[PDB]
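Crash report, auto-generated. Payload:
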Amino acid sequence: GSKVTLVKSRKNEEYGLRLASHIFVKEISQDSLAARDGNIQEGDVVLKINGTVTENMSLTDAKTLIERSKGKLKMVVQRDE
Amino acid sequence: GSKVTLVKSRKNEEYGLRLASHIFVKEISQDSLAARDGNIQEGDVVLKINGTVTENMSLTDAKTLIERSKGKLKMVVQR
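Recovered output after restart:
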């Protein structure tokens, strides 16, 4: 369901999980460029910011890319379509 | 890829994006403890690991929590 417990029987058994991290849009402010554009929505996973891939990037590092954008922000959003 | 370009043209303009991050299951190895369980799937968001909330946590920090789990991993996942 939502709860999962994995337990090892021996040392150096592996869990079998590889983790990663994604940057995503939590909120879009009213009266913003993002609100007016309408091609990006809350919940969208951001795959690239100004050419830089964001998989496994820390959130502070992703925010830095936006802060350094000089008024032009090109993003790639994940599509499963 | 769906490509979106936002352009500031005037003063006091905001992009308006508030970013966040999540930890998710990138791969589950074949015939492993995770594959057998059934309740964890590739692409699932991991919300909690051993009582610690993972939202906005870096991958390195989430991997540390797994490294320090001493053979028991209790998670809450979504999806």
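Post-recovery validation: The first strand of chain A starts at residue 3 and ends at 7.
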